[PDB]
Amino acid sequence: QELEAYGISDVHDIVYNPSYDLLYQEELDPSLTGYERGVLTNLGAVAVDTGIFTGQSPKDKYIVRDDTTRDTFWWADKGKGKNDNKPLSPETWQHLKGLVTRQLSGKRLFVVDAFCGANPDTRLSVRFITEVAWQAHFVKNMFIRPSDEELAGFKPDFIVMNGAKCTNPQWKEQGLNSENFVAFNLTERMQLIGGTWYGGEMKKGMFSMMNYLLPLKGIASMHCSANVGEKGDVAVFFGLSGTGKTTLSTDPKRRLIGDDEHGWDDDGVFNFEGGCYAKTIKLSKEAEPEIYNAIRRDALLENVTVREDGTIDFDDGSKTENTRVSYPIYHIDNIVKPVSKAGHATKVIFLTADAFGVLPPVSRLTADQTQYHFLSGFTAKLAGTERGITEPTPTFSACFGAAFLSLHPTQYAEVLVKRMQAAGAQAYLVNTGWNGTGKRISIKDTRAIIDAILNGSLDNAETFTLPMFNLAIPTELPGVDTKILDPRNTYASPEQWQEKAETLAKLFIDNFDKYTDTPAGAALVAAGPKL
Ligand SMILES: Nc1ncnc2c1ncn2[C@@H]1O[C@H](COP(=O)(O)OP(=O)(O)OP(=O)(O)O)[C@@H](O)[C@H]1O
Ligand SMILES: [Mn+2]
Ligand SMILES: [Mn+2]
């Protein structure tokens, strides 16, 4: 009846609000075939393969262009910086909606109702529809699980229909990138998924919608982790994928607010999600004990290698480097509860994994440097590794998450700065990546830096200015190996560091030029690196 209103017909079996026990038994059903199948690991958690897609597909992301979105969305084709917000006609949207609704017609469907956003005043009431048990599990893990009371009066104001099993044969004619699609309609308030089974598309899809609606009513919407000390002091950690937001916010000395998506309104910082989505490549029990410990029944492992005897080879990246596990946030012992939110952040930390080996492990940023490095959104990676090559490859992703921005970067920078100023927050840049050794800084050294930021040690330290990037760096910090604080010390000579710094400075300078078409942007150039 109600499923019909969405266009899904002849649904025989409806599993509304599936329990964790039911999801466990659905995933291990021995008659499942293909990518629906789960296998039980010795840690008690079920592991699945997500299919050919093992990460987001930005090239398949489309947003319907209509009178509601025309003048507010950050469109990929309106010459305002590179992004993945590709415009979609309403007519083609109706075609994709027919593909997905027909695929889900005549099937057994899982329907998960959940919240995106910790606060009733700004949260989305999302209804997720799928025919794959582990997809419903993923959304039960990653979104906010309502109370029985909230379920009774649940009134969806966004529908996500996951049609991973269907594809679009009309895509060439329609000007699309492939037979797969991840599409959003703000008029009908719906997300459609076709071709990719990857659960991340639903998580980041609703993130992108929050990123669109929250700043339009004065609320920051942020790609960050967040935690809070006993005294109520809040830290947020920005950064691109793989830079350490989840690894480093899971800190037994802090209460976890969230690991990936947060808003910032008049009362403080608040988590969007009900779970965490940790990377498991090379996962070390000794280095990341709380994340490791979260891997138990009700956690959902993705694309890991599971041996015949049920043990996991966390080292094996053969399916993908992006091996993951999701778990409800209460699989972490020390968290904020029952509501994932706290006060205003006073520490704002930009994580970056600098494969060029130039940036210092830690530096406290000026106000202009904060805006400069927020708009720049830099990280890099050794792309040549499988070829035995050191191909440092830069990524500049505005606000440390341009793939999920629905508005222009400046709109996120503006509201972040307003929130920071009102709170007297301070910002820091942390290289969680490489130095002159050609190896990453150890997790142990990085946690000690984060400690030094949070407890005021770094603020009381004697500092000097790193040349070129003009970053204030400490001579020493409690519990941190002193040699690494100056990035020049791990090369044969400061001159060898300088050669790489000049290379990276020019990358930053070229990237930043697109923000200088305003007076404020051009004024920020002086805060960036100077040859
Ligand atoms: N010094 C370090 N600091 C943080 N992480 C490190 C360090 N050295 C290695 N790592 C590894 O880098 C990865 C950090 O990934 P993490 O899951 O924290 O990324 P993220 O910022 O949460 O990304 P996403 O937004 O995609 O979820 C982990 O695999 C971690 O084990
Ligand atoms: Mn993460
Ligand atoms: Mn993320």
DSSP, residue by residue, 43-77: TS-EEE---S--S--GGGEEEE-STTTTTTS--TT
Distance CA 163, CA 196 (A): 8
Sign of dihedral through CA atoms 49, 52, 57, 63? negative
Do residues 274 and 339 touch, judged by C-beta distance below 8 A?
Answer: no
Question: Looking at residue 434, what DSSP letter applies?
Answer: B
How many other CB atoms are there within 10 angstroms of residue 37's CB atom?
17
3-state SS class at 124: strand
Please tell me the residue having the least CA distance from ligand 1 atom 7: 443
Let me know how long the chain is.
531
Going by C-alpha positions, the residue among 352, 363, 332 that lies closest to residue 466 is 363
Do residues 191 and 183 touch, judged by C-beta distance below 8 A?
Answer: yes
Which helix (H) or strand (E) is 224 found in, with range?
A: strand 224-228
Distance CA 122, CA 212 (A): 12
Sign of dihedral through CA atoms 428, 429, 433, 437? negative
How many other CB atoms are there within 10 angstroms of residue 10's CB atom?
9
Distance CA 181, CA 117 (A): 25
Distance CA 272, CA 257 (A): 10
Q: Is the peptide bond before 18 cis (omega within 30 degrees of 0)?
A: no
Our answer on whether the CB atom of 260 is closer than 6 Å to any ligand 1 atom is yes
Please tell me the residue having the least CA distance from ligand 1 atom 19: 242
At a CB cut-off of 8 Å and minimum separation 6, what does 354 contact? 378, 379, 380, 431, 433, 434, 504
Q: Locate the ligand 1 atom nearest the alpha carbon of residue 288 and give its number.
A: 31
For residue 243, give the ligand nearest its CA: 1
Question: Resolution of this PDB entry, in A?
Answer: 2.0
Please tell me the residue having the least CA distance from ligand 1 atom 2: 443
Distance CA 25, CA 51 (A): 21
Distance CA 154, CA 172 (A): 39
Going by C-alpha positions, the residue among 23, 378, 2 that lies closest to residue 199 is 23
**Strand duo 392-396 + 378-382: pairing:** antiparallel
Exposure string over 181-208, b if 16+ CB within 10 A, otherwise e: bbbbbbebebbbbbbbbbbbbbbbbbbb
Structure tokens at 326: 């999701």
Please tell me the residue having the least CA distance from ligand 1 atom 5: 244
Do residues 474 and 463 touch, judged by C-beta distance below 8 A?
Answer: yes
Distance CA 213, CA 399 (A): 17
Going by C-alpha positions, the residue among 484, 213, 458, 264 that lies closest to residue 357 is 484
**DSSP of 128-187, one letter per residue?**
EEES-HHHHHHHHHHSBPPPHHHHHT---SEEEEEETT---TTHHHHT-SSS-EEEEETT
Angle, alpha carbons 474-479-481 (nearest 5°) = 65
Our answer on whether the CB atom of 280 is closer than 6 Å to any ligand 1 atom is no
Our answer on whether the CB atom of 248 is closer than 6 Å to any ligand 1 atom is yes
Do residues 323 and 300 touch, judged by C-beta distance below 8 A?
Answer: no
Distance CA 176, CA 383 (A): 28
Q: Locate the ligand 1 atom nearest the alpha carbon of residue 225 and give its number.
A: 22
Centre of ligand 3 from the C-alpha of residue 223, in Å: 6
Distance CA 525, CA 512 (A): 8
Do residues 72 and 80 touch, judged by C-beta distance below 8 A?
Answer: no
Residues with CB under 5 A from ligand 3 (ion): 260
Angle, alpha carbons 97-102-107 (nearest 5°) = 130
Distance CA 140, CA 298 (A): 10
For residue 211, give the ligand nearest its CA: 3
Going by C-alpha positions, the residue among 258, 242, 262 that lies closest to residue 250 is 258
Our answer on whether the CB atom of 203 is closer than 6 Å to any ligand 1 atom is no
Do residues 261 and 341 touch, judged by C-beta distance below 8 A?
Answer: no
Our answer on whether the CB atom of 103 is closer than 6 Å to any ligand 1 atom is no
- Helices of type H across 263-382: 289-293, 367-376
**Strand duo 109-116 + 14-16: pairing:** parallel
Going by C-alpha positions, the residue among 164, 163, 245 that lies closest to residue 197 is 164
**Strand duo 124-130 + 109-116: pairing:** antiparallel
- Method by which the model was determined: X-ray
347 φ/ψ angles, rounded to the nearest 5 degrees? -120, 125
Our answer on whether the CB atom of 239 is closer than 6 Å to any ligand 1 atom is yes
- Say which amino acid occupies 171: W
Distance CA 278, CA 292 (A): 9
Distance CA 55, CA 57 (A): 7
Distance CA 349, CA 87 (A): 34
3-state SS class at 346: strand
Centre of ligand 3 from the C-alpha of residue 243, in Å: 10
**DSSP of 295-326, one letter per residue?**
-STT-EEES-EE-TTS-EETT--SS-S--EEE
Longest dimension (CA), the chain: 73
Question: Looking at residue 365, what DSSP letter applies?
Answer: P
Please tell me the residue having the least CA distance from ligand 1 atom 15: 242
Going by C-alpha positions, the residue among 329, 409, 334, 328 that lies closest to residue 375 is 409
**Range 76-83, long-range pairs (CB < 8 A, 24+ positions):** 80/408, 81/398, 81/402, 81/408, 81/409, 81/514, 82/402, 83/402, 83/403, 83/405
Mutate to test the pocket of ligand 1, among 208, 225, 227, 246 (most ligand atoms within 8 A of CB): 246
Taking only Cα atoms into account, the Rg of the chain, rounded to an integer number of angstroms, comes to: 23
Our answer on whether the CB atom of 129 is closer than 6 Å to any ligand 1 atom is no
How many other CB atoms are there within 10 angstroms of residue 84's CB atom?
20
Centre of ligand 1 from the C-alpha of residue 281, in Å: 10
- Say which amino acid occupies 52: I
| Side-chain-facing half-sphere of 357: CA atoms under 13 Å | 23
**Three-state SS string across 71-82, please?**
CCCCCCCCCCCC
Centre of ligand 1 from the C-alpha of residue 246, in Å: 7
Centre of ligand 3 from the C-alpha of residue 404, in Å: 9
Going by C-alpha positions, the residue among 216, 217, 218, 156 that lies closest to residue 191 is 156
Q: Which domains does the chain have, with CATH numbers?
A: 1-33+59-218 (3.40.449.10), 34-54+275-332 (2.170.8.10), 219-274+335-529 (3.90.228.20)
Q: For 479, left (φ over 0), alpha (ψ -120 to 50), or beta? A: left
Do residues 462 and 408 touch, judged by C-beta distance below 8 A?
Answer: no
